[PDB]
Each structure stands twice: as structure tokens, then as C-alpha cells.
Design a protein around this ligand. Structure first.
Ligand SMILES: [Ca+2]
Ligand SMILES: [Ca+2]
Ligand SMILES: [Ca+2]
Ligand SMILES: [Cl-]
Lengths: 154, 151
RNA sequence: CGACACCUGAUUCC
DNA sequence: GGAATCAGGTGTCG
């Protein structure tokens, strides 16, 4: 199980097939290690978009971890939108009604709020991993996030 | 009706055993039975599918040059090379070669060199659906493999 | 404008 | 069931 000095490692990823198209199918994915018992591939409730799938993949992780009574983790992801939110954009947003830099409702509020609710007491070390750059951890989490939005066909 | 004016040529580029044990790509260009210019050498460089399939078009016309031929019909199954040369290049030339997604068009170095030889020359690209018609393809296609074997 | 993603479609190969 | 690669489009924020 990947660790990094008392910081248990974890990769997360979200996906949303047909994002911005008629019927969006979106799922969350979180990989803790090979054949690891915490590796989830859930489907994302409600709104179907990559952005929330992505930040919610991260929620699942934290949510999971707490249950495993782990307080500090190095959570990798390829979502800058999530990282930038959770560690910058949010703070501001709170002090001003969650209004975008163009003066309008911070769209993914509900999502970030949840996510921030969970950073509480946790010492997350948000790390970013490149796209299809070949990093296992991320590709296995990607793998998972799809099986989470599986078609149900077969 | 009308006369006749060009020469035909089939071209194929292949990339092997995906994994690591390998990734051998070969070029292969056919001009007809036993014809001298028929050749199927190995692809020099970053061994890949697309890339080979392109340079495999360079050699073609490049030899077309070494024959003072001014216009041919080039056959190929990859409409990446085709689309690339018949369209996406002018665009790439008017955008510092940026993928219609912000990043850099990887085979610029290739599509560049290719557009070079296209100079003065008049190529009429012909795409052929896999398992197309005309043995011509199965033949170039065959040298490719033979090429990929050389060191 | 920029940035990180999420896709849809194509063509070939095996 | 990918790897090659591209076009076109959304998700969202500075
Ligand atoms: Ca992602
Ligand atoms: Ca992904
Ligand atoms: Ca071929
Ligand atoms: Cl013929």
C-alpha cells in the first residue's frame, strides 16, 4: 500500500462520458493500491459532469480514509479545477457569497462545500498528476472511474 | 474522352509488437511488380504507427523526384497522413502548429518534412479502406513488415 | 485570453 | 480494446 512518510497515498479520478452532450454518464474512481480492498468505482449521483465527478472522486477518498482512521494523505488527481478550488478559490469565495470572478454564482458551490466539510481535521497534500502521461496510479484510478459510470449493457 | 498523365504508387507504414520487447516500425513503398524503386526499409526514429505511415509517403514522392515525375496518384490506407497533408497543415501553419486542443501537433516534424517534398510536386492522395481493393496495398503493406525486420 | 480536465467522431494496426 | 492522432465540443475558474 503506497505511503509517503505517514502520508498514505491515493489516486482519484472522475469521468463523465458524453460530457456536455445529451445523456451524461459519470462516475468516480479511487485507487489505493493493487487489488486493494478500498478501491472504489462508484457512479456519481445527481448532475452528470466531469467537474463534480472529479471533485467528488476526491470526496470519496477522504470519506473513505476517515473511516480507516487516517488523518493525513497525499491525494493525487489530474483536476486542477479541484486542487485550485479546494486550496485557493474556495477561501475567497466564502468571503463574498460564492461569486465567480465575473460576478455570478460559483457553479460548483454545493460540491466544494461538501469537499471542504471533509478537509476538516484532515491533512491532505493535494498533488497533481499529468493526463495520459503514463502514471499508473492515475490510470488505474481512471480505469476505476469508468467502471463506475458503466453502461449496464454488459 | 481526355488523355492520361500520372503514375500510380501504393504506400504503407506499420508499427509492431506494442509493449517494449519491441516497437519496430517499417516503411514500404510499391510501384509495381519487380519494379526497381519498390523498397521496404526500416523507419529511422521514434518507432510509431502514424509517423512511419507518413515518411513512408515521403520516400514515395522523394523517389518520385529521382524520376523527374511531376504528378502521381498515391495510395494509402491511413487518412491521418492524408487528412494531415490535405487539410490540417495549412491550419497548423496558421497557429504555430497547435492541436485543436491547445497542445502541439506531435507529427509536425513529420508533416513538415512531408509538405517539403510536396513542393512543386502534384500529389493526388487516395485513401483505401482496410482490406480495400487492389493487391497493390497488400504488397506495399508487405514490404513494410519486411522493412520493420531490418536493423 | 489562459489553464486542467471530461468527452464525441473518425482512420489504420494488431 | 488498446496504441497511434486529429477535429470538434463541453465543464469551469481565474
Ligand atoms: Ca481526470
Ligand atoms: Ca481520467
Ligand atoms: Ca496499410
Ligand atoms: Cl492498381
Amino acid at each position: 500500500g503506497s505511503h509517503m512518510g505517514d502520508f498514505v497515498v491515493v489516486y482519484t479520478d472522475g469521468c463523465c462520458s458524453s460530457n456536455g452532450r445529451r445523456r451524461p454518464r459519470a462516475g468516480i474512481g479511487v485507487y489505493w493500491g493493487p487489488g486493494h480492498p478500498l478501491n472504489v468505482g462508484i457512479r456519481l449521483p445527481g448532475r452528470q459532469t466531469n467537474q463534480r465527478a472529479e471533485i467528488h472522486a476526491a470526496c470519496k477518498a477522504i470519506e473513505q480514509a476517515k473511516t480507516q482512521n487516517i488523518n493525513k494523505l497525499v491525494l493525487y488527481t489530474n483536476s486542477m479545477f479541484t486542487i485550485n478550488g479546494i486550496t485557493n478559490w474556495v477561501q475567497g469565495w466564502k468571503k463574498n457569497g460564492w461569486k465567480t470572478s465575473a460576478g455570478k454564482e460559483v457553479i460548483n458551490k454545493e460540491d466544494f462545500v461538501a469537499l471542504e466539510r471533509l478537509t476538516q481535521g484532515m491533512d491532505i497534500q493535494w498533488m497533481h498528476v499529468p493526463g495520459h502521461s503514463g502514471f499508473i496510479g492515475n490510470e488505474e484510478a481512471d480505469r476505476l472511474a469508468r467502471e463506475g459510470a458503466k453502461q449496464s449493457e454488459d
